[PDB]
Amino acid sequence: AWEVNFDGLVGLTHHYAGLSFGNEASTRHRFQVSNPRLAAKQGLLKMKALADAGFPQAVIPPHERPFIPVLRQLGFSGSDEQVLEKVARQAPHWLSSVSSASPMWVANAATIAPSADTLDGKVHLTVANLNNKFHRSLEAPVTESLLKAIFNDEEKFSVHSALPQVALLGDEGAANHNRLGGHYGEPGMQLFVYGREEGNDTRPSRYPARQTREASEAVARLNQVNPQQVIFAQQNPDVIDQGVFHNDVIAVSNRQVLFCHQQAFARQSQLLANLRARVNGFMAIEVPATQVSVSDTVSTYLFNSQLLSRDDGSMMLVLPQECREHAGVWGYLNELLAADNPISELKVFDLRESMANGGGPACLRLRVVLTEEERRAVNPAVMMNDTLFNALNDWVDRYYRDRLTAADLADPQLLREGREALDVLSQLLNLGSVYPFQR
Amino acid sequence: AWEVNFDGLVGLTHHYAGLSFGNEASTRHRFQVSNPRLAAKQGLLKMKALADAGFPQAVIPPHERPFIPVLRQLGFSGSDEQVLEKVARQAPHWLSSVSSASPMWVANAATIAPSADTLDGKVHLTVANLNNKFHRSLEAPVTESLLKAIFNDEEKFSVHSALPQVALLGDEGAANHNRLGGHYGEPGMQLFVYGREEGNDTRPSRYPARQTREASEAVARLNQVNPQQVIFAQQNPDVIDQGVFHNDVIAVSNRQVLFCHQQAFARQSQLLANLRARVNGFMAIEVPATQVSVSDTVSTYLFNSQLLSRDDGSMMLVLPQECREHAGVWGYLNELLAADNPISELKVFDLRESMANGGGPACLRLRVVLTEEERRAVNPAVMMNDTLFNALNDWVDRYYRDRLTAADLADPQLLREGREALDVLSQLLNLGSVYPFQR
Numbered sequence: 048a049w050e051v052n053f054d055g056l057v058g059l060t061h062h063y064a065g066l067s068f069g070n071e072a073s074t075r076h077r078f079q080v081s082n083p084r085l086a087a088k089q090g091l092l093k094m095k096a097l098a099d100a101g102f103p104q105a106v107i108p109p110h111e112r113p114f115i116p117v118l119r120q121l122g123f124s125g126s127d128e129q130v131l132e133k134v135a136r137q138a139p140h141w142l143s144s145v146s147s148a149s150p151m152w153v154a155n156a157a158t159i160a161p162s163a164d165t166l167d168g169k170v171h172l173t174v175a176n177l178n179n180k181f182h183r184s185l186e187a188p189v190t191e192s193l194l195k196a197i198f199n200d201e202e203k204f205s206v207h208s209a210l211p212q213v214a215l216l217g218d219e220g221a222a223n224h225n226r227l228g229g230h231y232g233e234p235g236m237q238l239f240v241y242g243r244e245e246g247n248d249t250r251p252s253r254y255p256a257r258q259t260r261e262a263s264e265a266v267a268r269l270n271q272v273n274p275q276q277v278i279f280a281q282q283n284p285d286v287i288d289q290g291v292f293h294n295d296v297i298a299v300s301n302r303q304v305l306f307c308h309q310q311a312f313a314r315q316s317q318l319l320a321n322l323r324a325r326v327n328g329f330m331a332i333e334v335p336a337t338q339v340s341v342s343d344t345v346s347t348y349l350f351n352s353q354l355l356s357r358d359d360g361s362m363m364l365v366l367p368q369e370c371r372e373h374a375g376v377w378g379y380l381n382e383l384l385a386a387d388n389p390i391s392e393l394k395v396f397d398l399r400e401s402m403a404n405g406g407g408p409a410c411l412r413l414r415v416v417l418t419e420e421e422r423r424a425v426n427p428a429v430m431m432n433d434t435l436f437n438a439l440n441d442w443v444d445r446y447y448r449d450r451l452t453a454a455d456l457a458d459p460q461l462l463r464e465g466r467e468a469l470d471v472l473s474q475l476l477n478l479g480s481v482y483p484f485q486r
Numbered sequence: 487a488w489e490v491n492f493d494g495l496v497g498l499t500h501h502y503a504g505l506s507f508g509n510e511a512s513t514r515h516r517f518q519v520s521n522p523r524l525a526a527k528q529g530l531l532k533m534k535a536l537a538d539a540g541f542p543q544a545v546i547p548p549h550e551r552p553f554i555p556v557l558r559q560l561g562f563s564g565s566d567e568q569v570l571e572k573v574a575r576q577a578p579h580w581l582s583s584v585s586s587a588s589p590m591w592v593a594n595a596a597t598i599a600p601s602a603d604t605l606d607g608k609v610h611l612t613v614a615n616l617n618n619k620f621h622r623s624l625e626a627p628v629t630e631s632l633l634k635a636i637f638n639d640e641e642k643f644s645v646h647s648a649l650p651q652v653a654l655l656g657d658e659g660a661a662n663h664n665r666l667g668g669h670y671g672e673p674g675m676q677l678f679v680y681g682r683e684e685g686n687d688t689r690p691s692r693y694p695a696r697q698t699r700e701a702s703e704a705v706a707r708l709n710q711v712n713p714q715q716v717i718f719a720q721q722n723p724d725v726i727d728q729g730v731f732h733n734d735v736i737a738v739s740n741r742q743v744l745f746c747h748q749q750a751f752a753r754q755s756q757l758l759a760n761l762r763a764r765v766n767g768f769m770a771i772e773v774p775a776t777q778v779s780v781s782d783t784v785s786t787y788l789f790n791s792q793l794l795s796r797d798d799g800s801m802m803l804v805l806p807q808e809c810r811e812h813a814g815v816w817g818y819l820n821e822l823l824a825a826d827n828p829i830s831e832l833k834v835f836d837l838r839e840s841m842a843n844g845g846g847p848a849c850l851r852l853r854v855v856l857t858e859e860e861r862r863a864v865n866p867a868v869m870m871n872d873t874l875f876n877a878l879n880d881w882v883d884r885y886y887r888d889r890l891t892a893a894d895l896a897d898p899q900l901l902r903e904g905r906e907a908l909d910v911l912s913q914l915l916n917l918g919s920v921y922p923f924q925r
């Protein structure tokens with residue numbers, strides 16, 4: 048089995064609305080001008096570079112945006128364009144909420160269970176409700192349709208609907224998930240990280256804890272994860288209060304390694320010890336606050352890196368350009384590179400558009416371990432290669448603007464462009480009529 | 487046009503699970519033995535008694551409980567009886583959450599807009615998401631089906647689906663709604679009360695504010711309420727922090743009267759002044775903390791009373807027994823009764839089972855103003871009369887238990903009793919296959 052990366056193709060309504068309290072990047076860049084075309088191309092370049100380097104790469108399409116059905120649910124009626132106009136004038140803030148390209152961060156799309164960890168031997172995917180943020184909670188229904196259109200062989204894949212939409216069951220998916228072990232194909236140890244749980248007072252006081260333990264346990268159940276291969280750990284409330292809104296902003300796993308900050312978890316010593324006694328050859332690379340502060344981790348996203356495995360067993364860290372621009376962080380990463388451990392190469396990518404909204408390399412990808420047989424069962428139209436890379440770039444040049452602001456979301460033209468764009472894209476990716484506007 | 491009262495028929499799984507933080511009665515009675523059959527009878531006696539007194543009355547049935555579909559959505563699979571078992575053994579607390587008789591409090595089923603207040607001249611009903619509490623949020627889908635089976639004539643009734651299930655749009659329906667004006671059939675002034683709103687620092691700090699202004703404004707749009715007959719007002723946060731989880735625990739309206747506690751609203755003086763200027767004949771009856779403390783207000787449910795109009799214009803207060811059993815409150819009520827004002831009669835009902843979970847006379851009913859023609863359009867099988875009364879009592883005698891504890895919710899027998907009872911009830915009330923288990 049190999050770990051295949053599925054990246055989100057940035058949607059054409061990508062803009063900065065500062066909709067995520069707790070996500071300092073989102074808040075900080077509120078109202079800045081975005082570049083949808085550049086954002087999409089930046090992500091496609093990373094996808095292609097990794098694919099050309101031999102790492103299985105795939106793509107997940109953007110959603111229908113602006114999403115008029117939700118506006119109708121909010122009390123606005125008439126034709127699509129009439130609704131758009133009514134809202135732009137009466138409640139413009141709702142326009143932004145239904146026009147976010149947020150589904151691009153597929154690390155939040157679902158939680159994956161490789162067939163080696165499940166009871167029925169199938170690959171399980173449970174859609175994340177993303178209930179904490181309204182603009183993201185809207186994603187689940189379409190994300191479910193997309194996942195079923197991509198992992199469409201029901202004999203090999205089981206897609207489960209998102210958990211009930213309530214704070215008690217807040218779920219953010221793979222971004223709070225981890226998998227440790229030997230080769231990807233062997234049964235692994237799944238680590239679910241949460242920010243709060245009922246009956247526990249240890250919880251953030253400034254920024255919200257989007258993930259609840261209750262949600263994580265339900266996901267573990269849905270994905271039929273062997274109860275002996277599961278472990279739940281609470282994120283350090285202090286780091287969440289400093290900007291770590293998902294575990295992937297403070298820690299990342301791969302094979303036998305867990306690269307994390309010293310302040311990542313609550314009861315960190317106990318967790319590492321438990322993992323040490325349950326995962327053969329487990330190695331924890333812990334970054335001390337003296338070399339990298341929590342504040343520096345949040346601004347650089349060094350932990351939102353992709354930790355890849357090369358054929359020699361050595362690893363490569365995929366990082367956002369901000370890690371190279373911060374003296375202290377670039378210095379540490381190179382110390383790590385030279386240090387005696389699995390990390391033997393650093394790879395940097397420019398994902399400025401995504402980072403401006405709090406999403407780095409890892410946020411843009413969803414890791415799915417697949418056996419040779421299961422890989423062939425995936426919709427081949429979404430697997431990255433020269434043909435898809437060129438087709439997607441041409442598609443982006445045809446429909447994306449190199450400039451967008453919240454004010455442009457009221458442009459009925461943008462609406463029109465987006466519909467046609469997604470119509471063609473669903474054809475290119477052999478997804479069928481997966482979008483609501485297509486039914 | 488007349489105001490018709492639709493009451494909730496208590497479900498067979500009525501039990502105390504302390505599931506509602508902020509609802510002190512619920513919290514106070516956690517795990518006490520309940521009496522489903524008695525709870526049902528108490529409610530029907532109030533329905534029948536008001537009907538006999540000349541007040542149009544109707545009924546809304548309970549829901550499917552335990553609700554197995556939600557448990558499966560939570561990860562527990564297998565046949566109905568296997569899920570029940572697994573849950574009881576693995577996570578029994580979920581059993582209570584999916585077995586609550588909470589839909590009985592129909593004051594939270596939806597928000598109503600009579601035809602005299604709407605832009606298209608129809609009766610509008612928008613289902614409440616009840617997003618704040620997980621066990622009640624589960625109600626919306628079935629509540630919508632029930633409302634559509636009762637107000638089926640689409641030329642006269644417009645039922646709208648519940649708002650998106652997110653905290654930003656928390657909606658608790660009619661319990662936070664008010665309608666003032668001359669006669670019921672005349673255009674009235676709708677007063678929407680909310681607990682919080684984005685950007686507003688004024689909010690409760692102890693108990694949650696379940697209703698947001700954003701939701702209120704969205705429902706006003708969905709119900710097509712004439713913009714000049716709508717007013718939004720914030721609940722006094724300090725009273726929410728004392729147990730007023732809904733507006734109907736601190737204030738109640740009827741015709742030109744607004745019976746409320748002095749500490750009910752923020753900027754109350756100005757709110758009442760605005761009402762006096764915009765509502766002809768408006769009369770506020772404020773109870774000062776000196777005469778009735780907020781604590782005694784929440785313990786007796788003085789304001790969760792039903793304020794009814796007598797044929798001669800005078801009014802009657804339908805109260806729960808606690809009001810008569812509390813010397814101080816009973817004293818005030820009698821002073822109010824004697825004093826020169828519209829309140830000329832007091833009527834008390836034993837609703838101990840409902841009150842133990844924080845529901846009084848008003849909580850158990852949903853006010854729906856209907857013209858003669860609209861009244862004729864309502865499903866006739868749900869209107870209260872001797873036939874229906876005797877039929878429902880026999881039904882209760884045949885399927886309801888006299889005792890119930892949380893531990894009993896795991897009994898596959900209870901599941902069967904309920905499914906069968908509802909199947910029979912659907913026929914009696916002529917609702918067709920309205921429940922999920924019937925589909």
Ligand SMILES: NCCC[C@H](NC(=O)CCC(=O)O)C(=O)O
Pocket residue numbers: 062063064065066067070073074147149152154155183222293404405406407410
């Ligand atoms: N894994 C990274 C997710 C980033 C995402 N940002 C946003 O939704 C910001 C959108 C805006 O503010 O325009 C979030 O907060 O979940």
Ligand SMILES: NCCC[C@H](NC(=O)CCC(=O)O)C(=O)O
Pocket residue numbers: 501502503504505506509512513586588591593594622661732843844845846849
């Ligand atoms: N309008 C009053 C409704 C009372 C209801 N009680 C409850 O759901 C308590 C159920 C329990 O805790 O078993 C509520 O809190 O909304």
Ligand SMILES: [K+]
Pocket residue numbers: 383384385386387388389390391
């Ligand atoms: K190294």
Ligand SMILES: [K+]
Pocket residue numbers: 822823824825826827828829830
């Ligand atoms: K009086």
